[model samples]
Target: PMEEEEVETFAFQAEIAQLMSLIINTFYSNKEIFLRELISNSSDALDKIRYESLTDPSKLDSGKELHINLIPNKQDRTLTIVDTGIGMTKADLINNLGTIAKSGTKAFMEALQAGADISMIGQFGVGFYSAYLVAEKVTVITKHNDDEQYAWESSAGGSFTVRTDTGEPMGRGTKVILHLKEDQTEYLEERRIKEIVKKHSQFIGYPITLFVEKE
Candidate 1:
């Protein structure tokens, strides 16, 4: 009810937080499946910007060739998924993570609280959150078309923070680093990740590069 043009703000429903938990722990089912899910996502990310670039290259200042980099290191027990397409800013990370309680994780919790099958789940692939499936700590470093580079990190399913990681300009893209847990070591094997990439993202228009670090 604004007679003149006063600004109005609305808070997220109080149930939002509750909904988040149910959504994560339930909908994600078996967490191991998330590796393919994320790599597939990295490919789709390239598709979007490539399509746009076909019509307009100036849209991205970096002007780098479009590609996705999937690097898995067994020694450190980590897997890093990267893209040479559009990246992000500090605010973008928070806005995406903080908003949208993701498929009503809270409401689903209420249903389970009343004793519904624990299997009751919802979907809205904040699938990004699924990185926790195999990771103890996650770091997302990105450089956007029009902003300073930043790194977003989180661990143990709690809050995350965004800070400068070496002021490194991935030149314009995203680098998602997953510090894999000891049990998730298989992901660090080159053959395994390549199999998953070929199986899921082989049809992508751009190349998917696999990097190896020499000791």
Candidate 2:
């Protein structure tokens, strides 16, 4: 049985507000890149678990295949990306998503100010914010092997929340659910998603699958 857990909210590090604004407005010309950025992040997470499992076999979720699943819900106007990868602990969520680790964020801001072609900003380690290009709200539910499942949510507001997840338990992975913006429904199309994955992440080592509903 699940107990009612307190939902804790934390303010985004000062730099995050500015960083997210830049990503949302500056990258509007290439909004499709949001999918690429997210898929890349998932691949990185999968790679981490695989490498960690090399030494400590327990790091791998037993009997579960390592892969990414893209599920688009038309009725809900949401697109969910699920990965059986190295999920984040509570602190990991706060640090990784909430704060703009000064180094990368500073470099990115500098490059933008210098008028550099910012196409490569995704590699600055801030690609997570790209999700805001197409989503109005983002919800992440993750379970690390060593920590209890937690949910992190934000609407690009100044603050985000992390709470113990009381929903269905995930074996070991992360699920990012994007509440699509009104004009971004194209992302929900199976063909569009497949095209994006095919173009940008075709060479990703892990198997990427899309869930299609029966007609």
Candidate 3:
């Protein structure tokens, strides 16, 4: 359950805003790679929980299994990636998605100019921002033991807002919603999602599943 509280808005670090534009424009060469980047991040989150669970078995939260699922809503033009892993706290959302600890702009630019592979572009924690490549708006709904469930949203339009979620509890983990751009509608296809997951995350430790509408 989410606590009732005032929402807050924060601006992305100057470099983050700059790189947002760079990522949106430059990453287009491999737009499908966005799914790969996200799965990698989710895997890292699940791995963290597993490691912590070894030290404090309570960290597993009653033997929660690690898995990822894709949910798409064609009418809303959105694609959601749900992970039953270590969920993020409110602070984590702001830190992980809104700011970069070290500046990689120069290296990123050089790599872009050098015709580096799309996989090579992400450095530090900037990989999450790849969501902007397809999303006009992005929302992350996450729940962690340390912090209550919350929703963090942004348009990659310079600033973002965070508010306690007023919806059903997620138990524990993260759900990332990419509100797809009108032109990038192919991501909504079930076939496309399975193909992307197979291509990049096939050998990952956890299970990956795609959600589809029932007849």
Candidate 4:
């Protein structure tokens, strides 16, 4: 059995709470855009590791190929986005996932209410919240080159929690698991996920593969 780590809970930054509320309650159109936003975030992490590897070849010592995996669990009603890329430190989870647009929260809220394109929300650096559109809970397991692996979890509630992970090491990367809402089961279908990836991330820099269970 794996040992358990102490979990630390923190309230979401004021802006993040507001953004999440808007995403969960107000935003209704283009819910599918959540996949695109998540994939884009993974691409950014991949790019960061690639750039770092150019300077310190040791960064690739793990010999793990850089790629992204879209895993759908019909039994669990969950969708997981896994990437072998630059992962996050515990602090990264607290700061990156907790805060949003700094003082620009007002502008972001305005853009959201104005019916701005969902893609534009990604530009404001809060695309992660889009997951709340389809998921009741989101869990992130990440391992950074300089830090131990950690797990960050939230339900788009007022706060989130972080703890050291005692499970199998994921090397240097991140895995985001979305505990989908009942109405969001379409995301678990292979055909639907493929269509979303082809439509939005077809030209992404790294290979994106969807898990196929052997019959």
Best by lDDT: 4
Ranking by TM-score: 4, 2, 3, 1
lDDT of 3 by residue, 1-215 (tens): 96567889888888778778777766457878888888888898889888888888877763478888888889889999988788887668877877545477667756766787666655644677778888989999998876788999998778888889987788778999999999889999988888888787788898888888763
* Index of the highest-TM-score prediction: 4
Tens-place lDDT digits, model 2, residues 73-143: 99999999999999998888888888645567778877877775555668687878879889989999998
Which of candidates 3 and 4 is the stronger one according to lDDT? 4
lDDT of each prediction vs. the true structure?
0.65, 0.84, 0.81, 0.86
RMSD of 1: 8.7
Q: Give all TM-scores, in the order shown.
A: 0.73, 0.91, 0.90, 0.93
Give candidate 4's whole-model lDDT: 0.86
Q: How many backbone clashes does candidate 4 have?
A: 0
Stretches of candidate 1 off by over 4 Å are 1-30, 104-123
Error of 4 at 203 (Å): 1.3
Model 1 lDDT per residue over 75-194, tens place: 778899888866766666566545445555555556656765433332444456557667778788887777877777766344556666565557777889999867778778878777
Q: Give the TM-score of candidate 3.
A: 0.90
Q: Which ten residues in a row are the worst by lDDT in model 4?
A: 99-108
Instruction: Pull out the clashing pairs in model 1.
Output: 18-106, 19-105, 19-106, 20-106
